[PDB]
Design a protein around this motif. Structure first.
Motif, mmCIF file in Angstrom:
data_model
loop_
_atom_site.group_PDB
_atom_site.id
_atom_site.type_symbol
_atom_site.label_atom_id
_atom_site.label_comp_id
_atom_site.label_asym_id
_atom_site.label_seq_id
_atom_site.Cartn_x
_atom_site.Cartn_y
_atom_site.Cartn_z
ATOM 1 N N UNK A 92 0.774 -1.242 0.000
ATOM 2 C CA UNK A 92 0.000 0.000 0.000
ATOM 3 C C UNK A 92 0.810 1.299 0.000
ATOM 4 N N UNK A 93 2.091 1.167 0.208
ATOM 5 C CA UNK A 93 2.933 2.330 0.200
ATOM 6 C C UNK A 93 3.178 2.828 -1.227
ATOM 7 N N UNK A 94 3.501 4.117 -1.345
ATOM 8 C CA UNK A 94 3.809 4.690 -2.646
ATOM 9 C C UNK A 94 5.279 4.456 -2.926
ATOM 10 N N UNK A 95 6.034 4.643 -1.865
ATOM 11 C CA UNK A 95 7.438 4.429 -1.942
ATOM 12 C C UNK A 95 7.919 3.534 -0.812
ATOM 13 N N UNK A 97 14.354 0.148 2.172
ATOM 14 C CA UNK A 97 14.505 -0.777 3.241
ATOM 15 C C UNK A 97 14.293 0.017 4.527
ATOM 16 N N UNK A 98 14.838 1.239 4.552
ATOM 17 C CA UNK A 98 14.744 2.095 5.726
ATOM 18 C C UNK A 98 13.316 2.427 6.118
ATOM 19 N N UNK A 99 12.447 2.626 5.137
ATOM 20 C CA UNK A 99 11.088 3.001 5.441
ATOM 21 C C UNK A 99 10.237 1.842 5.886
ATOM 22 N N UNK A 100 10.772 0.640 5.727
ATOM 23 C CA UNK A 100 10.073 -0.587 6.105
ATOM 24 C C UNK A 100 9.597 -0.599 7.576
#
Ligand code: NPG
Ligand code: NPG
Ligand code: NPG
Ligand code: NPG
Ligand code: NPG
Ligand code: NPG
Lengths: 367, 367, 368, 367
Positions: free
Chosen positions: C77-80, C83-86
């Motif tokens: 569901x994320x746009x971007x 690995x960090x944003x995980x």
């Protein structure tokens, strides 16, 4: 006893009104119920997990799977079974406290019913009724909140607990204090919504004289709460962090808590909950009973537990109707801001088949 | 439950052999027994006081008096009575733990029997038998002692405890370690025999490798103990100082104790005893059951208690015959160094009257 | 960049030898692998759970379900995605660190490959090879133990770790120290098998000069470890308890730990694992890399990780064949008691299709 | 990669308005720039030293010298250079963090560009833009001050930071607060201008609800900060003192800091800076990005750094124009109180030669 089997049942019970916490909104209640079967009789247990892992890592499907594949089977394997033995019997399985708490509860209900003993008696109750507070959710509007608060207040609710989140703290508080007065029993619950860095914001609550602030930081952040405690006036109350009597002792020793919310499922059962109580009492730490939007089933057991000696503040033991138009057991009714401690053996309550069947979504037998 | 009345007996059991402590020698044990009478049936209580005030300020006659005049009446005057409620009911009376404990015990026995529940069950036992050790007294000589010890070893006892006092410390110890070996569970008991200033002497046993040193200084000397723990190698174990679960928490928090000796009567009853257990357990403090040279009545309860999870060290749960030629109940028999937990309701044991009457020195009905 | 989906695969791999710890005996390895698909290409993650929740609350079926129903959907569901944003993206879901770590692992590998960068580079490696120790389980007999150990020693392993438990502590230690000497790096691991009440028995290990004693007490008992530490001479090392960089900081502060075992899956991923390394380092606490009987996939990421500056003790990064006759990637072979850090993009390794397919028990595609 | 060489360039950039701190007034910015050359391409580094050793012991000439004669030569000597390896490779040289940090930066820019990776990706950015504060120097007049402050606030800056000094602390603050209100995010910076004895003076700021007081005492005085924290309400923030991740840990442990300003050059590099952020985060210590009046090069790296997760307070990452009318790179332009995180590989920015050339004073090539 000899465990014959356990019937696992899924139930969905619509909320009377959406319940919103920092972890989200809830309109319905999905729950897991267990029916333990002994050659002798049955015992009921209720799991406190929700659909998804939002309050804790445990969730409905998860609890079902573990019970099903690991916990129930281990008990069935045991020659002779006792509610106290459940613990040791299930020790090899790491975590899954709620699931374990639910099973133990079922087992205990059956075991006590057999000794013709109430949960209250077994737990060490010292009173026949308990004062009830209410847990008020996050609102869309303040006015909205105020009506609500005022409402519960009229119902006869003894204490008011407000769910808070960043952007829903000081104001809502300021509002209730103002409108409702300074003698209302008032406390807040962050459900882990803050960080140490938010201390100043929370310090902003200092002036309203709340009994406490519940679980401002994450579950694992004990030392953080101790630090926080040192920056705010409002007493720290832990919920999520209290997963056991040992957890309680450690937190207390560390200065991370002054009041503890005891939620039996959270700690792995009513037996451990009893231990929590005693440990806190021994350290001069008051406790209060937490609630997980339970059916009359958990409600009953909780009322029993809340009648213990150190439960010195009103707990989250509201009447049936605060959430449910229709309960699966005989309802719990507020009589003078209190609830009556059940009298029969075991829980002192049992589902009204008719009603139960009405809300059952799934069922499975485990033998 | 409704208390009908209590019958108080004085009994006098003749010790197999005289037992010498740091407070005096013993030839005959004078005990105070309780028979609580209810609607349903009766229950038995056992007081751990002695003839006179040497282990504690409580003694047979004072106990009788308080019970007779204060305690019993308080309960009689109650509507519903449960063993749990006993505490609250007697709370206005300061102290008299042994007396209260005995009373509570009698009540509990009757309550459990009514639910067909055993003590063990009620207490949360998880084990069916318990490892037993023996308490060895102050000998007038070495061989004397070395013999006895050796003797007890033979019968199956798993651990040896050695009564100590200034002039009976390091030597006796030195001798047994020497003679019997090092892989023997050995420990000592000063019964408040020393003082902080005695530290250097008590430092003297470092070498031997005892499981613990029990109550080296006064009841009230907690800090002294923690200090002391500082100046010695042998783990401090407290007895006398442990008068309650709070007492335990405090001593623990102050680093004044590593292992705790639990004596139900000293702490006011089996219920508080259970809490002491739970408190210790939450703090990783091992516990063991202390003995007061009791009949099969206190012995049965102790055994049940001793079967709880945190009793990780063998207790002073020596066989009936260790002290008594003829018990007033079925006796207790070592077996593999264990004692089997009683399965019958309440204590699961009761006095054989002839036996009992043979020993009774007095009675009083209180209604 | 933008997650296309993730493939969830169940795999079963026979151990060349049964491995016994205080929590039981394993003869086969049941794993959960992830193939994350991104526009930029695919990446592989390996979950460290076992069949049942014996080392921790997480287990294969549990991990799969949570990934499938909560975690994967959330990243999809994320746009971007990075690995960090995980982590932030999955933060609303409590716990499930192993599951999350596997997912972050798969993303990071795809991501890194896209940048043609290796895990080692990404993590800040300073060394091209790492000293390897071996983890030896509980035996039926001592002699039996003595042989096994002798064999490893022969293979060139730099350190021996012994699985212990009540009734298999002092003797085995004594026996090995007896037979192989005092110069060998020796350590034990109780996998929570003891309690504070057991200090005295544990204190019996003092004389053997062990490097450390790992996770003697239960996972939640931090304070007890600090207390235990005061009671014994062997250094305390924690595994199970270290669930995050904050957990490490707290234990450190409380004096509950002297050496930390770092397990990427246990802490929620390689990224968090680096943080733990860094936090320990800042506190002067040495670390070493733990192992979970991984396939070449996790082994490769572990080797990279273990090449970091603060990993000053040999880790549980043994050659492939210590467990697997046939690994699913190129195997890791010991040389001079060391393992080479992988050099290609991402993990620097990938499964051999036929090999993987042969051990695969189930597979499912999770897309939007 | 292999380092081919480095071009060391001296640059002088005039400030739009002089900048006064406790250590002095700045009218023109004298920087040192590094252009790293590798077989593949180049990378740019920026050193934060100033002409003289007034903020720290490091200064422009010193930096250039150590880089030329020791640092650079060490990197050229290595076969394989990686940003990570710069540390170990330069480890034998004590100190000179800002200089080492500059070199690392240039190497890292080249290294990342080679992989087509941005500084933000490498650092672990979680956001695409960052909220910006502004640092305001000492004024001659309070009115001059309010004017400046209102101007920045008008531009949309999210936070106001005031340089303070004995004789310019309470007044300035009182005034801004009076004028601009209690809702403004306001903090102060002494740049080590006070002593423990000045505590009463600083305590005088308590009423003003500042976010923090930055570096009140000298760099080496950690314990002093801890003590000061005790006497004042304003949270202590350290800058100068935090020369590394270990220093942060230590200071945190000693209770000397509650909030940490992270300055990449100060700590010896963006890599070390990431470690500080992480160490702080693990201890619940919020961090924010410090500024050194950088060109677009450092500005770029800082903005990427500031987008990391525990940078929960606005940093000194103002628009290019806050200092420079004409930056040597594409300029940073404030938008909705924020600056966008660069998207290109490495810095995501490069100098505009033409521009760069105009401000270049000196240049050398080290091969
Ligand atoms: O009154 C009740 O039963 C609910 C009170 C309440 O706040 N429960 C919350 C909680 O976080 O404690 C909750 C309900 C359901 C599930 C999880 C949490
Ligand atoms: O009763 C036993 O089995 C052992 C006796 C024992 O050691 N207890 C002692 C004591 O001082 O602790 C005791 C016995 C009788 C009365 C008082 C004390
Ligand atoms: O994910 C699916 O659709 C099937 C897998 C599944 O249902 N896992 C279940 C189960 O009931 O078997 C489960 C495992 C663990 C935890 C929760 C659920
Ligand atoms: O992987 C290795 O080389 C050794 C593995 C090892 O000892 N891990 C054990 C452990 O408890 O640490 C383990 C393996 C698999 C699963 C859980 C635990
Ligand atoms: O002092 C001088 O003018 C001659 C030496 C000099 O410039 N020192 C330099 C250098 O560039 O060699 C230097 C040394 C140390 C620190 C800064 C500069
Ligand atoms: O916004 C900025 O870039 C400058 C903020 C600031 O106050 N920098 C000061 C400082 O004391 O931190 C400074 C500038 C240049 C050199 C040294 C110090």
């Amino acid at each position: 006893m000899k465990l014959s089997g356990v019937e696992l049942r899924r139930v969905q019970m619509p909320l009377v009104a959406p319940f919103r916490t920092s972890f989200g909104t809830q309109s319905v209640r999905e729950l897991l119920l267990l029916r333990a079967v002994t050659p002798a009789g049955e015992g009921w247990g209720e799991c406190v997990t929700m659909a998804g892992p939002l309050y804790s890592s445990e969730y409905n499907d998860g609890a079902e799977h573990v019970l099903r594949h690991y916990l129930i089977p281990a008990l069935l394997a045991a020659e002779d079974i006792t509610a106290a033995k459940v613990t040791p019997l299930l020790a090899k399985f790491k975590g899954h406290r709620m699931a374990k708490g639910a099973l133990e509860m079922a087992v205990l209900d059956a075991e006590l019913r057999a000794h013709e003993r109430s949960f209250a008696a077994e737990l060490g109750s010292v009173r026949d009724s308990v004062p009830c507070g209410v847990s008020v959710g996050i609102m869309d509007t303040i006015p909205q909140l105020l009506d609500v608060v005022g409402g519960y207040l009229d119902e006869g609710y003894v204490r008011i607990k407000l769910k808070i989140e960043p952007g829903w703290d000081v104001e809502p508080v300021r509002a209730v204090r103002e409108r409702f007065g300074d003698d209302v029993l008032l406390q807040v619950d962050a459900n882990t919504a803050y960080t140490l860095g938010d201390a100043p914001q929370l310090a902003r609550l200092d002036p309203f004289g709340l009994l406490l602030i519940e679980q401002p930081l994450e579950e694992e952040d004990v030392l953080g709460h101790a630090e926080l405690a040192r920056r705010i006036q409002t007493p720290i109350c832990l919920d999520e962090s209290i997963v056991s009597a040992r957890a309680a002792a450690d937190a207390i020793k560390l200065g991370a808590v002054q009041i503890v919310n005891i939620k039996p499922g959270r700690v792995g059962g009513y037996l451990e909950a009893r231990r929590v109580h005693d440990v806190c009492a021994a350290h001069g730490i008051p406790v209060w009973c937490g609630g997980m939007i339970e059916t009359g089933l958990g409600r009953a057991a909780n009322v029993a537990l809340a009648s213990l000696p150190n439960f010195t503040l009103p707990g989250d033991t509201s009447a049936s109707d605060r959430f449910y138009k229709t309960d699966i057991t005989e309802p719990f009714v507020l009589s003078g801001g209190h609830l009556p401690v059940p009298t029969g053996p075991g829980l002192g309550v049992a589902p009204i088949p008719e009603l139960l069947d009405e809300v059952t979504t799934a069922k499975v037998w485990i033998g």
